[PDB]
Coordinates of C-alpha atoms in Angstrom, one line a residue:
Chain A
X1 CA -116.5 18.0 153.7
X2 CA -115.1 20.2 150.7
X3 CA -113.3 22.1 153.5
X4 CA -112.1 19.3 155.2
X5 CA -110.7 17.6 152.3
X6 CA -109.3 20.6 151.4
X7 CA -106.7 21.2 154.1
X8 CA -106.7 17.1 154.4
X9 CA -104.9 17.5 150.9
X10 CA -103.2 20.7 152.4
X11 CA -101.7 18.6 155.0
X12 CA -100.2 16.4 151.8
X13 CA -98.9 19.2 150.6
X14 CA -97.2 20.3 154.1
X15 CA -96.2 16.9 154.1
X16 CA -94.5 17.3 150.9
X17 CA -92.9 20.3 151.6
X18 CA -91.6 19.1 154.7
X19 CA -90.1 16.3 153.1
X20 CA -88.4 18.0 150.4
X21 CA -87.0 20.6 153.0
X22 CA -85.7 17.7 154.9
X23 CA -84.3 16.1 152.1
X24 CA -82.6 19.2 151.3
X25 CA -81.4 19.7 154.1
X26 CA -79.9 15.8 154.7
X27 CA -78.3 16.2 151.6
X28 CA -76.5 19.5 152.0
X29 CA -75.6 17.7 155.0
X30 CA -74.2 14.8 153.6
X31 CA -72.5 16.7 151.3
X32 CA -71.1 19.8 154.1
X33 CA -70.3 16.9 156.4
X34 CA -70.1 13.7 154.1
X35 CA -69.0 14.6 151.3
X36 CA -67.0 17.7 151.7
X37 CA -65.4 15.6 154.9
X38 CA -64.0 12.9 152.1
X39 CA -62.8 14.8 149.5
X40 CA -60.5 16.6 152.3
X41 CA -59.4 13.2 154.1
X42 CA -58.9 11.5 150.8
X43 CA -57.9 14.1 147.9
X44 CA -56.0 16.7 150.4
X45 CA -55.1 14.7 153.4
X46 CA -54.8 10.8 152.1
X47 CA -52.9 11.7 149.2
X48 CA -50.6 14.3 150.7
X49 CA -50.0 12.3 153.7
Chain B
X1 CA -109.8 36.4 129.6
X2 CA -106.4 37.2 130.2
X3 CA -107.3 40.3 132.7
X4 CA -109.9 38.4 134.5
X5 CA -107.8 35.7 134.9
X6 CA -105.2 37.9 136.2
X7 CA -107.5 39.1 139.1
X8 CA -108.3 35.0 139.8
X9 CA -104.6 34.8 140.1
X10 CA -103.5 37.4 142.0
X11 CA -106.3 37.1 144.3
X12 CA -107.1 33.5 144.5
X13 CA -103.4 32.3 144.9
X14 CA -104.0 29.8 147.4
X15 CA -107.1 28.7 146.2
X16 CA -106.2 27.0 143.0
X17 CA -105.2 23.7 144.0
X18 CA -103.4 20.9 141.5
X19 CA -106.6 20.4 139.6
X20 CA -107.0 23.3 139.1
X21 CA -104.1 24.3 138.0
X22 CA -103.8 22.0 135.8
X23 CA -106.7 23.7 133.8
X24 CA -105.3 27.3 134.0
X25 CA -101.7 26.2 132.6
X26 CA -104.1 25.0 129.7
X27 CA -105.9 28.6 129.7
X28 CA -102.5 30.5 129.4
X29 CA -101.2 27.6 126.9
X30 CA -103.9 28.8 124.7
X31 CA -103.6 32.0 125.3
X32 CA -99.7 31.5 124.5
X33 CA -100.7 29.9 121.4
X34 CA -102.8 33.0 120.6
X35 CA -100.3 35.7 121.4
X36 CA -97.7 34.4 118.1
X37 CA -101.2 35.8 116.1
X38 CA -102.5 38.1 118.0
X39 CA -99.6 40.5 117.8
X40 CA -101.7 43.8 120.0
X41 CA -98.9 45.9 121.9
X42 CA -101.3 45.8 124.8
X43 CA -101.9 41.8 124.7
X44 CA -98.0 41.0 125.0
X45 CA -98.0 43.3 128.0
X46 CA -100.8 42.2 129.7
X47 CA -100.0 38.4 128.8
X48 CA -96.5 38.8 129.3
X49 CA -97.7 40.9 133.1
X50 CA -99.8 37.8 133.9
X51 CA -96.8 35.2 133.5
X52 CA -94.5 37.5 135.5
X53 CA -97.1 37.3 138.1
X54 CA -97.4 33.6 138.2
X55 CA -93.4 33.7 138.3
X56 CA -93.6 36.0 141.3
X57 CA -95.9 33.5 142.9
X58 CA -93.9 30.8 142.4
X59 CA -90.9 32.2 143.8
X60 CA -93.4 33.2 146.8
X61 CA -94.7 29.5 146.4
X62 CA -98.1 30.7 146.6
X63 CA -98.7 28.7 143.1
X64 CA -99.3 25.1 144.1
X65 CA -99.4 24.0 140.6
X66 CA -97.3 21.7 138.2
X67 CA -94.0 23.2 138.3
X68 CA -93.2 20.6 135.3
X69 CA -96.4 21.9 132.4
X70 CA -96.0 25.5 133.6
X71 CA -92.0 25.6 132.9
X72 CA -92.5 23.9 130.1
X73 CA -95.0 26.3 128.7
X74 CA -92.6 29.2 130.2
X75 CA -90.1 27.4 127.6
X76 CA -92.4 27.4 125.1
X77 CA -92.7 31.4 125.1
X78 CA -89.1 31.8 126.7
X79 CA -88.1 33.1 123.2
X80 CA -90.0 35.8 124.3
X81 CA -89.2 39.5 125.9
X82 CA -89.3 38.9 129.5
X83 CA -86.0 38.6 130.9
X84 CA -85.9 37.6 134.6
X85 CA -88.2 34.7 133.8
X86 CA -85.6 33.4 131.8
X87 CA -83.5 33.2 135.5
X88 CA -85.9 32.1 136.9
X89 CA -87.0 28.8 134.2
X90 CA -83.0 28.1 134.1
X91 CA -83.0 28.2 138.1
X92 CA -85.6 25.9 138.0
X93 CA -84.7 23.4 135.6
X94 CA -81.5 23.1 137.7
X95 CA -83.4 20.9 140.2
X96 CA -84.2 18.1 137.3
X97 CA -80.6 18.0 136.5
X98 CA -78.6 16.6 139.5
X99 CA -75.9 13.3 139.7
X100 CA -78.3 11.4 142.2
X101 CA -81.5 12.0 139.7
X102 CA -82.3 9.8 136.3
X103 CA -81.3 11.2 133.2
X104 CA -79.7 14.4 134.5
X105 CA -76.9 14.3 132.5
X106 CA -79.7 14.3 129.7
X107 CA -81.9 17.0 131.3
X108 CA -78.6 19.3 131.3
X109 CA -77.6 18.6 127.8
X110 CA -81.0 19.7 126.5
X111 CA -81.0 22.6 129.2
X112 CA -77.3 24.0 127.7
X113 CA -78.5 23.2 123.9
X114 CA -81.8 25.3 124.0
X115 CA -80.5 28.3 126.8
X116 CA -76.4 27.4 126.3
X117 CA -75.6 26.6 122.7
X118 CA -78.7 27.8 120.8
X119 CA -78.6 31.2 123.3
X120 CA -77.7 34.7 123.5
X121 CA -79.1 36.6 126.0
X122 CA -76.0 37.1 127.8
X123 CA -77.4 36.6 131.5
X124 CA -79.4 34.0 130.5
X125 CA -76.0 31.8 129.4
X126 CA -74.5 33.4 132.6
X127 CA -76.9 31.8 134.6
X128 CA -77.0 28.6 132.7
X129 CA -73.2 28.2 132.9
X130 CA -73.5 29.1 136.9
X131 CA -75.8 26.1 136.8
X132 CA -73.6 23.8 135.4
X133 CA -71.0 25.4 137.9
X134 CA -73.2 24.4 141.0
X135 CA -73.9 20.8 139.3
X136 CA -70.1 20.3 138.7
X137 CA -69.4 21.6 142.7
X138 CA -72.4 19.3 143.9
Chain C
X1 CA -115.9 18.7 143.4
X2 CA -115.2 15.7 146.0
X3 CA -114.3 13.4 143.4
X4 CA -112.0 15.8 142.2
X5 CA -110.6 16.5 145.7
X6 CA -110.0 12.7 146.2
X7 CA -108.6 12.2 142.7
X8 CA -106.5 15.7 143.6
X9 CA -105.4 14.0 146.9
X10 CA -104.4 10.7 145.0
X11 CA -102.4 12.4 142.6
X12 CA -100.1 14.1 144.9
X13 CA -99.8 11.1 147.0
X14 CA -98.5 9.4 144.3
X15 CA -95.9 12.7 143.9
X16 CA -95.0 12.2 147.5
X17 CA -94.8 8.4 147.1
X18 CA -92.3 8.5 144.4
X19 CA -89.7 10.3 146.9
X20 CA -90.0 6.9 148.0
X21 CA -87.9 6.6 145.1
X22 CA -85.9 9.3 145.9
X23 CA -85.3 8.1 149.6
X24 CA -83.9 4.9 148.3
X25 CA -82.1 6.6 145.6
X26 CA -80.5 8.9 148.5
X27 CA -80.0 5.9 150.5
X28 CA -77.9 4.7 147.8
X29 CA -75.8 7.7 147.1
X30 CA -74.9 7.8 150.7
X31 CA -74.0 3.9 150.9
X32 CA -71.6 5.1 147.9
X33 CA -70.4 8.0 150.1
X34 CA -70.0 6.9 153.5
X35 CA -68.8 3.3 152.4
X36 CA -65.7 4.6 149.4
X37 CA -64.8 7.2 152.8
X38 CA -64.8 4.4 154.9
X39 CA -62.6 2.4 152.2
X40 CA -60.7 5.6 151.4
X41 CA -59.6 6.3 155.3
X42 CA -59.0 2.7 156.0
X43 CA -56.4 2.4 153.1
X44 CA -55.4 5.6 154.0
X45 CA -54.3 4.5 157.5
X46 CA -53.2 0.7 155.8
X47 CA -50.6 2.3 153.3
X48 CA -50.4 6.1 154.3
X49 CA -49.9 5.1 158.1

């Protein structure tokens, strides 16, 4: 049961992990994709155009 | 106790789990406590040895620890020799400071006033000011 | 040793609970993102255009 509980908690751990990767990974997303995206279409394009 | 508790770590990595941790930051925060008094040549190495291998293990991420206690007792002794840690503590705190995250304008202020404007190492403000860089881009 | 494991497991479900926190925090950022680009282009297209 020590053993079990230990990779249960393990697997909250990996669960962890995997969320903050993914979080990571959404956010340099949205900002790549997002973010990046509006400061060209607004600051460069919108206000050139 | 520092040397055997340098063989627990660099063995036993994986083994020490939150709990656990959470006692050992304790040990070395006594031991940290110890070393302004202590003052042997041979105690700073092997003390600061046994931090740098804690810092190797966390940027393995083989420590499972508190990442909050053990940086702040890395602060505690950053006025001390070791120089990459200082990277390393700076890197970290990064990740508290961050436009999305509560009091990060805060956590930055107190991150350039201890390692910025109270600083001299000159990497160490290099770093800090790259920091502030990357929040400023982000 | 198994309380501690359950009290262990508890505490860092409560550290992967609070980026429950940090979802909705995220959620937010990105309903400032998206929605001022979404503003930005369609003004962009109402004056620029």
């Amino acid at each position: 049961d020590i053993q079990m509980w230990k990779v249960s908690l393990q697997k909250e751990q990996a669960r962890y992990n995997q969320l903050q990767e993914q979080r990571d990974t959404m956010v340099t997303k949205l900002h790549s994709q997002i973010r990046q995206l509006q400061h060209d279409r607004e600051e460069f394009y919108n206000q050139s155009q | 106790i520092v040397l055997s508790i340098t063989r627990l770590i660099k063995k036993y990595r994986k083994e020490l789990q939150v709990v656990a941790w959470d006692i050992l930051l304790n040990i070395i925060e006594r031991l940290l406590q110890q070393l302004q008094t202590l003052d042997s040549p041979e105690l700073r190495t092997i003390v600061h040895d046994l931090l740098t291998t804690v810092e190797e293990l966390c940027d393995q991420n083989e420590f499972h620890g508190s990442q909050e206690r053990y940086f702040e007792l890395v602060e505690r002794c950053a006025d001390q020799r070791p120089e990459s840690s200082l990277l390393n503590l700076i890197s970290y705190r990064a990740q508290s400071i961050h436009p999305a995250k509560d009091g990060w304008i805060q956590n930055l202020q107190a991150l350039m006033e201890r390692f910025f404007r109270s600083e001299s190492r000159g990497a160490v403000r290099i770093k800090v000011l790259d920091v502030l860089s990357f929040v400023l881009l982000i």
